[PDB]
Coordinates of C-alpha atoms and ligand atoms in Angstrom, one line a residue:
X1 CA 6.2 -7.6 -5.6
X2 CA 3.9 -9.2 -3.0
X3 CA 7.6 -10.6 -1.1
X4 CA 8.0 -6.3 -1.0
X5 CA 5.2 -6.0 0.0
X6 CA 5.2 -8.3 3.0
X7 CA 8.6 -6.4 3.3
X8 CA 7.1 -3.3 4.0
X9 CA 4.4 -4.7 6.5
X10 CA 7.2 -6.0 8.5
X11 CA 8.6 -2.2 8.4
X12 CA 5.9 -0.7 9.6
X13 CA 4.4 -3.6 12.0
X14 CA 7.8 -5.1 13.5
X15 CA 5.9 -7.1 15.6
X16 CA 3.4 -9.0 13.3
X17 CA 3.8 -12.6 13.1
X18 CA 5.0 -14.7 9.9
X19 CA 3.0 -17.4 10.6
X20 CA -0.2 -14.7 9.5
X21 CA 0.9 -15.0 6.3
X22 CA -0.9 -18.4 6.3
X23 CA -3.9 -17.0 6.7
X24 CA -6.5 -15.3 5.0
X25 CA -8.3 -12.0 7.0
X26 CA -12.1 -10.3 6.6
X27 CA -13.2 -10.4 2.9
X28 CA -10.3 -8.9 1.3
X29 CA -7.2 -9.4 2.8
X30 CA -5.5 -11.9 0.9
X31 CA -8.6 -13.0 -1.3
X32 CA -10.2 -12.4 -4.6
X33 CA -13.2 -9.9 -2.4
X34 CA -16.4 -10.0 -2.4
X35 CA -18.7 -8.2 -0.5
X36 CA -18.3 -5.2 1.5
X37 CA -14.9 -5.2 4.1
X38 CA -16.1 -6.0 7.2
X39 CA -13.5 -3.4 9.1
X40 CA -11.2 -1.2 8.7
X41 CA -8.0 -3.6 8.3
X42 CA -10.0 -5.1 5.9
X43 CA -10.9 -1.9 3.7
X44 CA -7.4 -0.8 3.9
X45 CA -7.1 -4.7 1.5
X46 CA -10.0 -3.2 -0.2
X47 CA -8.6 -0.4 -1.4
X48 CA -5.1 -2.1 -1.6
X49 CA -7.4 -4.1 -4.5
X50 CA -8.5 -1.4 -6.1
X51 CA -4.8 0.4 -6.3
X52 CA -4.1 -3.0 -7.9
X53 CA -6.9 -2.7 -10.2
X54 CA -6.4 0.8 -11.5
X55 CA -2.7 0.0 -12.1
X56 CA -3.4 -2.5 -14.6
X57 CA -5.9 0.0 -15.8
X58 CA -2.8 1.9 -17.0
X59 CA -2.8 1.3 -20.8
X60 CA 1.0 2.2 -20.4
X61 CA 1.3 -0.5 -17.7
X62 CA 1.7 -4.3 -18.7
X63 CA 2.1 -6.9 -16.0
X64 CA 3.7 -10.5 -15.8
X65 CA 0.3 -12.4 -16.5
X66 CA -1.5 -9.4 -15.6
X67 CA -0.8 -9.9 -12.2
X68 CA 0.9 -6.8 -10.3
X69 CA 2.2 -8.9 -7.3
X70 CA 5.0 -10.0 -10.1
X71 CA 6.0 -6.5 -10.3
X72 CA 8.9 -6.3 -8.4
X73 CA 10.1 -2.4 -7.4
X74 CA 12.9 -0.9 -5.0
X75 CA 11.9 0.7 -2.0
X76 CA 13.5 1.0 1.4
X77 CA 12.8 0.5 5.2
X78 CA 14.2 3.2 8.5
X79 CA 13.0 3.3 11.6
X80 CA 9.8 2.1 10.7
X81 CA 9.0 4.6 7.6
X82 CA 9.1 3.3 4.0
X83 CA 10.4 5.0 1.2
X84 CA 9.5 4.4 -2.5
X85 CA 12.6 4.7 -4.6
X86 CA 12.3 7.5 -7.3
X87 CA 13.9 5.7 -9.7
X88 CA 10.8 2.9 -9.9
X89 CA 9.3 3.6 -13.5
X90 CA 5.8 4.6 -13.6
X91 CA 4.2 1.5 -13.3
X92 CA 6.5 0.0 -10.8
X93 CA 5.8 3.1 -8.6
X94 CA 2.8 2.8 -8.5
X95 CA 2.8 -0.4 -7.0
X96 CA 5.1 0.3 -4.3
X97 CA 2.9 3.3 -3.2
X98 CA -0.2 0.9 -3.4
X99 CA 2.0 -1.4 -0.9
X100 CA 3.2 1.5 1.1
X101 CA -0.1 2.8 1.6
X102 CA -1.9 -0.2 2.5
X103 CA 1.0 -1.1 5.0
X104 CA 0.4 2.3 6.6
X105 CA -3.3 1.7 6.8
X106 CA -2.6 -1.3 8.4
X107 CA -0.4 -0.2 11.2
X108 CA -3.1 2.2 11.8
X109 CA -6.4 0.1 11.9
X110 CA -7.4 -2.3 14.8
X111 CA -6.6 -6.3 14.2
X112 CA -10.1 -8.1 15.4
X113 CA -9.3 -11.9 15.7
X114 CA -12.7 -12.6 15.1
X115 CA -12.5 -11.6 11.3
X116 CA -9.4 -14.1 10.7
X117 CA -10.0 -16.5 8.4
X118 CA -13.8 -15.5 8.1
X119 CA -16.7 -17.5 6.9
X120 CA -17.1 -15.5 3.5
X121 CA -19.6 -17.1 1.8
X122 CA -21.8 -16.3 5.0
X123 CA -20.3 -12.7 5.8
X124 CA -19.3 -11.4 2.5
Ligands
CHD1 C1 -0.7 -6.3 9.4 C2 -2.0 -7.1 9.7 C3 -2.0 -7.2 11.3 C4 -1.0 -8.1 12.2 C5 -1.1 -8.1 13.7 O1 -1.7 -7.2 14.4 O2 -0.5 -9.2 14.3 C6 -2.4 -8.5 9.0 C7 -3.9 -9.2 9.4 C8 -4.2 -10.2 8.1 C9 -2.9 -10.0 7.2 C10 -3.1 -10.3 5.6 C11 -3.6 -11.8 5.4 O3 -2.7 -12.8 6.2 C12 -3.8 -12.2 3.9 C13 -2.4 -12.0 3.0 C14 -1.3 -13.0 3.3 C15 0.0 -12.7 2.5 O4 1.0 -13.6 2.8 C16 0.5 -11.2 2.7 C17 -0.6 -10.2 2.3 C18 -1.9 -10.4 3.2 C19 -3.0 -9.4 2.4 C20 -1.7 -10.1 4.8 C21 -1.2 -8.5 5.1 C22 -1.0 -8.4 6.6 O5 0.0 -9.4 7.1 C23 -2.4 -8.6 7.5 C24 -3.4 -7.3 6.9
CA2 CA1 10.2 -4.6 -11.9

Protein backbone atom coordinates (compact mmCIF):
# COMPACT_ATOMS: atom_id res chain seq x y z
CA UNK A 1 0.00 0.00 0.00
CA UNK A 2 1.29 3.52 -0.97
CA UNK A 3 1.79 4.14 3.40
CA UNK A 4 4.38 0.79 2.57
CA UNK A 5 5.53 2.11 0.10
CA UNK A 6 6.67 5.49 1.56
CA UNK A 7 7.78 2.90 4.20
CA UNK A 8 10.30 1.53 2.13
CA UNK A 9 11.60 4.88 0.69
CA UNK A 10 12.26 5.85 4.21
CA UNK A 11 14.37 2.31 4.40
CA UNK A 12 16.34 2.93 1.79
CA UNK A 13 16.68 6.94 1.81
CA UNK A 14 16.89 7.57 5.86
CA UNK A 15 17.45 10.98 5.18
CA UNK A 16 14.61 12.12 2.78
CA UNK A 17 12.28 14.58 4.17
CA UNK A 18 8.46 14.00 5.03
CA UNK A 19 7.51 17.26 4.14
CA UNK A 20 8.42 15.81 0.17
CA UNK A 21 5.58 13.98 0.39
CA UNK A 22 3.63 17.21 -0.29
CA UNK A 23 4.99 17.51 -3.38
CA UNK A 24 4.69 16.32 -6.75
CA UNK A 25 8.37 15.58 -8.76
CA UNK A 26 9.17 15.57 -12.87
CA UNK A 27 6.19 14.11 -14.83
CA UNK A 28 5.63 11.04 -12.95
CA UNK A 29 6.41 10.93 -9.57
CA UNK A 30 3.39 11.25 -7.86
CA UNK A 31 1.07 12.07 -10.96
CA UNK A 32 -1.20 10.57 -13.44
CA UNK A 33 2.19 10.90 -16.35
CA UNK A 34 2.38 12.25 -19.28
CA UNK A 35 5.04 12.73 -21.42
CA UNK A 36 8.35 11.40 -21.39
CA UNK A 37 10.29 11.48 -17.59
CA UNK A 38 12.40 14.19 -17.57
CA UNK A 39 15.34 12.21 -15.46
CA UNK A 40 16.15 9.42 -14.04
CA UNK A 41 14.34 9.79 -10.57
CA UNK A 42 11.58 10.50 -12.61
CA UNK A 43 11.73 7.21 -14.91
CA UNK A 44 12.32 5.10 -11.92
CA UNK A 45 8.14 6.70 -11.21
CA UNK A 46 7.75 5.78 -14.78
CA UNK A 47 8.37 2.46 -14.61
CA UNK A 48 7.06 2.31 -10.94
CA UNK A 49 3.69 3.19 -13.17
CA UNK A 50 4.01 0.74 -15.39
CA UNK A 51 4.65 -2.12 -12.56
CA UNK A 52 1.34 -0.72 -11.36
CA UNK A 53 -0.18 -0.99 -14.63
CA UNK A 54 0.74 -4.57 -15.51
CA UNK A 55 -0.36 -5.68 -12.00
CA UNK A 56 -3.78 -4.84 -12.58
CA UNK A 57 -3.14 -6.43 -15.96
CA UNK A 58 -3.21 -9.65 -13.98
CA UNK A 59 -6.59 -11.18 -14.79
CA UNK A 60 -5.96 -13.17 -11.41
CA UNK A 61 -5.40 -9.81 -9.70
CA UNK A 62 -8.39 -7.61 -8.46
CA UNK A 63 -7.82 -4.38 -6.72
CA UNK A 64 -9.83 -2.13 -4.16
CA UNK A 65 -11.33 0.18 -6.94
CA UNK A 66 -8.75 -0.91 -9.19
CA UNK A 67 -6.32 1.06 -7.52
CA UNK A 68 -3.02 -1.02 -6.32
CA UNK A 69 -1.97 1.71 -3.76
CA UNK A 70 -4.92 -0.04 -1.61
CA UNK A 71 -3.11 -3.17 -1.66
CA UNK A 72 -1.60 -3.49 1.44
CA UNK A 73 1.42 -6.40 1.67
CA UNK A 74 4.06 -7.27 4.49
CA UNK A 75 7.52 -6.52 3.86
CA UNK A 76 10.37 -5.61 6.17
CA UNK A 77 13.20 -2.92 6.65
CA UNK A 78 17.34 -3.80 8.06
CA UNK A 79 19.98 -1.82 7.72
CA UNK A 80 18.69 -0.14 4.84
CA UNK A 81 17.68 -3.39 2.62
CA UNK A 82 14.02 -4.26 2.14
CA UNK A 83 12.69 -7.48 2.07
CA UNK A 84 9.41 -8.70 0.51
CA UNK A 85 7.74 -11.26 2.69
CA UNK A 86 7.22 -14.68 0.90
CA UNK A 87 4.14 -15.12 2.24
CA UNK A 88 2.47 -11.91 0.20
CA UNK A 89 0.01 -13.78 -2.35
CA UNK A 90 0.75 -13.27 -5.90
CA UNK A 91 -0.79 -10.11 -6.47
CA UNK A 92 0.24 -8.53 -3.26
CA UNK A 93 3.87 -9.53 -4.25
CA UNK A 94 3.94 -8.02 -6.81
CA UNK A 95 3.26 -4.88 -5.50
CA UNK A 96 5.77 -4.86 -2.94
CA UNK A 97 8.52 -5.71 -5.48
CA UNK A 98 7.04 -2.77 -7.69
CA UNK A 99 7.65 -0.63 -4.35
CA UNK A 100 10.88 -2.17 -3.56
CA UNK A 101 12.26 -1.66 -6.90
CA UNK A 102 11.30 1.77 -7.42
CA UNK A 103 12.70 2.70 -3.87
CA UNK A 104 15.98 1.23 -4.88
CA UNK A 105 15.94 3.17 -8.10
CA UNK A 106 15.47 6.05 -6.16
CA UNK A 107 18.30 5.80 -3.72
CA UNK A 108 20.32 5.33 -6.76
CA UNK A 109 19.28 8.21 -9.17
CA UNK A 110 20.34 11.98 -8.62
CA UNK A 111 17.42 14.45 -6.90
CA UNK A 112 17.46 17.73 -9.28
CA UNK A 113 15.52 20.49 -7.41
CA UNK A 114 14.71 22.04 -10.55
CA UNK A 115 12.29 19.22 -11.61
CA UNK A 116 10.14 19.51 -8.22
CA UNK A 117 6.96 20.38 -8.66
CA UNK A 118 7.50 20.96 -12.52
CA UNK A 119 5.45 22.93 -14.94
CA UNK A 120 3.88 19.80 -16.77
CA UNK A 121 1.67 21.08 -19.06
CA UNK A 122 4.87 22.99 -20.48
CA UNK A 123 7.57 20.14 -19.89
CA UNK A 124 5.66 17.00 -20.29
C1 LIG B 1 13.23 9.56 -2.76
C2 LIG B 1 13.11 10.85 -3.63
C3 LIG B 1 14.35 11.77 -3.16
C4 LIG B 1 14.48 12.59 -1.79
C5 LIG B 1 15.66 13.40 -1.48
O1 LIG B 1 16.76 13.32 -2.10
O2 LIG B 1 15.48 14.26 -0.46
C6 LIG B 1 11.73 11.76 -3.73
C7 LIG B 1 11.70 12.97 -4.86
C8 LIG B 1 10.13 13.22 -5.20
C9 LIG B 1 9.43 12.14 -4.27
C10 LIG B 1 7.97 11.59 -4.79
C11 LIG B 1 6.92 12.83 -4.88
O3 LIG B 1 6.94 13.55 -3.59
C12 LIG B 1 5.50 12.35 -5.37
C13 LIG B 1 4.85 11.20 -4.44
C14 LIG B 1 4.47 11.70 -2.96
C15 LIG B 1 3.86 10.53 -2.11
O4 LIG B 1 3.54 11.04 -0.78
C16 LIG B 1 4.85 9.33 -1.97
C17 LIG B 1 5.23 8.76 -3.42
C18 LIG B 1 5.88 9.90 -4.37
C19 LIG B 1 5.88 9.14 -5.79
C20 LIG B 1 7.36 10.42 -3.79
C21 LIG B 1 8.48 9.18 -3.72
C22 LIG B 1 9.80 9.84 -3.15
O5 LIG B 1 9.54 10.41 -1.81
C23 LIG B 1 10.49 10.99 -4.20
C24 LIG B 1 10.71 10.11 -5.63
CA1 LIG C 1 -3.49 -7.08 1.17
Amino acid sequence: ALWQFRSMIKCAIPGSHPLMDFNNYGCYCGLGGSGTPVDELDRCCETHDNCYRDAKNLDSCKFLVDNPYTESYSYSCSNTEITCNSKNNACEAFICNCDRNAAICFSKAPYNKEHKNLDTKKYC
